[PDB]
Amino acid sequence: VSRIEQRCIDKGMKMTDQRRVIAQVLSDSADHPDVEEVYRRATAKDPRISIATVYRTVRLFEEESILERHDFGDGRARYEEAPSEHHDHLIDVNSARVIEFTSPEIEALQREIARKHGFRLVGHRLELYGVPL
Amino acid sequence: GHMVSRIEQRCIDKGMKMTDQRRVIAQVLSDSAHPDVEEVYRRATAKDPRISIATVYRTVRLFEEESILERHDFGDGRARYEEAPSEHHDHLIDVNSARVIEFTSPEIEALQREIARKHGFRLVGHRLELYGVPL
């Protein structure tokens, strides 16, 4: 059971082996594949998987908030597993590009702010807005 | 891509979806400085001829509901819009009671500038909301 497949099972989504292959490809990918790469890797596994099935499945994984479709800085639609906790966002105000980041350091300070006011931190939303240097 | 206008930034603060029409309307509002709906609509249609006055009205109303815009009658009877005040404090929210605890953290702000810097950016704004339950 791949992470993406596990996510599908939680959503009560219909799964078949072709959808499982696509889920596995997305889960095993070291990069953030575009649809062409998902297709190439999925058909390398089972050549019966059509390009249409790949588009349909990735879109479904999007619509069920299992995958995020994201521009990592190349203007391409690339796919990533939607994380267990939301990534923080740094927005380029000149282009509207979103840089997703994680900061265990900021998280530690967030916990301290919650603790000092007598709270357990249960979540956060952080947006940063920047202009390119 | 597009420039993130000052009003679009307020939308992003709220986690609102930036549809093309909302982006255009946010940009027009940002470039205006107390338009009525007709002025917003005329300016929005200069950018996207297919935007309707209904869409403009509904969008400015939504922005008002989310405290992005304020609406006032300055005497001429027209509802006129302006950017709502924004908070200087970040918020810790007790989710059980829906109560706000204001805080400022120069420390966390220094870290935010460091993140921006590391990615090749100067920080021009931020919003932080923390969600908590009592210990």
Numbering used by the authors:
A (entry chain B): 2 to 134
B (entry chain A): -1 to 31, 33 to 134
From the paper:
In most bacteria, iron homeostasis is regulated primarily by the ferric uptake regulator (Fur). Several holo-Fur structures have been solved, revealing a modular domain organization including an N-terminal DNA-binding domain (DBD) and a C-terminal dimerization domain (DD).
The apo-MgFur structure was determined at 1.55 Å resolution. The results showed that apo-Fur is made of two monomers that form a stable dimer, with both monomers consisting of residues 1–134 and nine disordered C-terminal residues. The buried interface comprised 1,628.4 Å2 per molecule, indicating a very strong interaction between the monomers. However, their DD and DBD conformations were almost identical (r.m.s.d.=0.9 and 0.4 Å, respectively).
